[PDB]
């Protein structure tokens, strides 16, 4: 009864939380076993960061130029190197609260949980998704960066995204705990597009399930589709192009609520077509897409 | 850059969250200093929920029907009692992970941080709101009882929460930690009806700062208007209508963005009797309003 975005508990992922501060830079820091990750770009000045030469910079930098803070206690660095867009500080400490945890790299589409961090001290947590074109719509201030996007399979904390950057247009970009960019962004301050954004169909099938599980089975109808037709509505709309393995996926949700999966994509399309003459669906007059399949069977 | 619904950092919390079993029901439960709080219905069996004597009950109740268990280490129960609408069982042990905490009462319109639970295990975190007639829409399934709703001011956790129930409306019901229901509604399956709910008028004035903050402008308007007329609109729609006080509280939030608040509600007005024309706030064709004009400042 009810839906909400909730948020995996954050409790794993704040024992995890450092100050990572190099010149008059600084951000956060994730601190694992006996290494502590954090955007590269912590070394850039203000010059630089219009086009930095980011072995030149780590080059002049040494060890004790790195200062790292677990709360109040200060770590001794002992190592520095760089893995793509990341910093990997070695320690002479193995973080006693490091869970079992995991760097894994998502899919356009899967949500994730962020816990947001200014000087290693949490602030709050959200639930969010990976936009199609590898952008995210976050909370994120100066010192933002650093913090981790991550998802809990039971007791394993697998870390999902690092936040580096705000683009021009109000939206955000990071790495995996690798370092790669989700995206085609670098980390350097010049023109960089976005893309076209689209919405996460399969998300929102999944969240029109949720809503005749709580009671809101207005927008059902007795028609019917096919796969390719309602694609074709999902591209005059910009909707991601559903798939079989998509129906597939919605299977569990379907055995739930006794309602085949391309009878949705029939409502959905009239949705779409014919909008929702300001009614709701779970108290949101905008079709929702940041809840994966697997994220309302988790929530029920 | 950017605005979420973000919850406080669930970390302290889930170090306090317990399992309570009695009889066959089992629901969670607080574990602070020695004492670990449970909505009292934990005694109740299937007839008795027509309507409960819960002295009748708690009497032919002994410690030892009380198992108490925190994570996977059973807890001693040593005295049992009931404060109102809820179970207060001594217990020898003070739980080690207790934090600074409070037990405060909250006003209609202040928004909270929830950490739902089942066998006593975090499962997520949501933030939400306490409606001016005292239910939340919240996101519970069976067993969800004795979860706890909490801001956290800085090292302090401030409890004003407890669930209780879901109303057939779909609608929750629950105290605070004393265990007075927020509202008319007592812990028996009878009925009880939820009342008029209307919109918190100063968390919607609250919201609308916090886009002129993050680029919507959008519904701003050369207009003005007098507190009085305002409320008279407000009341045609189903809006709490708006006080001094309120003008007061939310005089940080002018000051930063150089707008009157009564200009805000001049667009206020606009956007209720005009709507929004499909348009958009922060990604949200709907005026939200569970965002405190202190939410706004806290996540700036
Ligand atoms: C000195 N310094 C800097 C930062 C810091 C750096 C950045 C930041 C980092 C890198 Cl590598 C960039 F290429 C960058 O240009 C992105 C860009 C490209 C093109 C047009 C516009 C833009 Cl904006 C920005 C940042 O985006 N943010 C931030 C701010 C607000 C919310 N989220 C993120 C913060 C910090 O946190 N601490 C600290 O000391
Ligand atoms: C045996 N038993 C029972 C519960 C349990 C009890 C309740 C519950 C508790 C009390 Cl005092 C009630 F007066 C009650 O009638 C509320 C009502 C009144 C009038 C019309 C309809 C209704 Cl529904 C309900 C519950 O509401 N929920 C729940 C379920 C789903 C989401 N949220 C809350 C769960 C439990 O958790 N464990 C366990 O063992």
Same mark, same amino acid.
């Given at each position: 009864?009810?839906?909400?975005?909730?948020?995996?508990?954050?409790?794993?992922?704040?024992?995890?939380?450092?100050?990572?501060? @190099?010149?008059?830079?600084?951000?956060?820091?994730?601190?694992?076993?006996?290494?502590?990750?954090?955007?590269?770009?912590?070394?850039?000045?203000?010059?630089?960061?219009?086009?930095?030469?980011?072995?030149?910079?780590?080059?002049?930098?040494? $060890?004790?130029?790195?200062?790292?803070?677990?709360?109040?206690?200060?770590?001794?660095?002992?190592?520095?190197?760089?893995?793509? @867009?990341?910093?990997?500080?070695?320690?002479? *400490?193995?973080?006693?609260?490091?869970?079992?945890?995991?760097?894994?790299?998502?899919?356009?589409?899967?949500?994730?949980?962020?816990?947001?961090?200014?000087?290693?001290?949490?602030?709050?947590?959200?639930?969010?998704?990976?936009?199609?074109?590898?952008?995210?719509?976050?909370?994120?201030?100066?010192?933002?960066?650093?913090?981790?996007?991550? $998802?809990?399979?039971?007791?394993?904390?697998?870390?999902?995204?690092?936040?580096?950057?705000?683009?021009?247009?109000?939206?955000?970009?990071?790495?995996?705990?690798?370092?790669?960019?989700?995206?085609?962004?670098?980390?350097?301050?010049?023109?960089?597009?976005?893309?076209?954004?689209? *919405?996460?169909?399969?998300?929102?099938?999944?969240?029109?399930?949720?809503?005749?599980?709580?009671?809101?089975?207005?927008?059902?109808?007795?028609?019917?589709? *096919?796969? $390719?037709?309602?694609?074709?509505?999902?591209?005059?709309?910009?909707?991601?192009?559903?798939?079989?393995?998509?129906?597939?996926?919605?299977?569990?949700?379907?055995?739930?609520?006794?309602?085949?999966?391309?009878?949705?994509?029939?409502?959905?399309?009239?949705?779409?077509? $014919?909008?929702?003459?300001?009614?709701?669906?779970?108290?949101?007059?905008?079709?929702?897409?940041?809840?994966?399949?697997?994220?309302?069977?988790?929530?029920?």
């Amino acid at each position: 009864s009810g839906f909400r975005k909730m948020a995996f508990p954050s409790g794993k992922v704040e024992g995890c939380m450092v100050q990572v501060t @190099c010149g008059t830079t600084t951000l956060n820091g994730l601190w694992l076993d006996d290494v502590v990750y954090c955007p590269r770009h912590v070394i850039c000045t203000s010059e630089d960061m219009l086009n930095p030469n980011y072995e030149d910079l780590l080059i002049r930098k040494s $060890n004790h130029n790195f200062l790292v803070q677990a709360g109040n206690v200060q770590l001794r660095v002992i190592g520095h190197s760089m893995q793509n @867009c990341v910093l990997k500080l070695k320690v002479d *400490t193995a973080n006693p609260k490091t869970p079992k945890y995991k760097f894994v790299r998502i899919q356009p589409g899967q949500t994730f949980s962020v816990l947001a961090c200014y000087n290693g001290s949490p602030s709050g947590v959200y639930q969010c998704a990976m936009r199609p074109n590898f952008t995210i719509k976050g909370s994120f201030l100066n010192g933002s960066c650093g913090s981790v996007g991550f $998802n809990i399979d039971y007791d394993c904390v697998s870390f999902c995204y690092m936040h580096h950057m705000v683009l021009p247009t109000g939206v955000h970009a990071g790495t995996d705990l690798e370092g790669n960019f989700y995206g085609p962004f670098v980390d350097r301050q010049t023109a960089q597009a976005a893309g076209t954004d689209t *919405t996460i169909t399969v998300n929102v099938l999944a969240w029109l399930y949720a809503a005749v599980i709580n009671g809101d089975r207005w927008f059902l109808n007795r028609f019917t589709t *096919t796969l $390719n037709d309602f694609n074709l509505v999902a591209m005059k709309y910009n909707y991601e192009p559903l798939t079989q393995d998509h129906v597939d996926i919605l299977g569990p949700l379907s055995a739930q609520t006794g309602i085949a999966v391309l009878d949705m994509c029939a409502s959905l399309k009239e949705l779409l077509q $014919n909008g929702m003459n300001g009614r709701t669906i779970l108290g949101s007059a905008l079709l929702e897409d940041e809840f994966t399949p697997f994220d309302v069977v988790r929530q029920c």
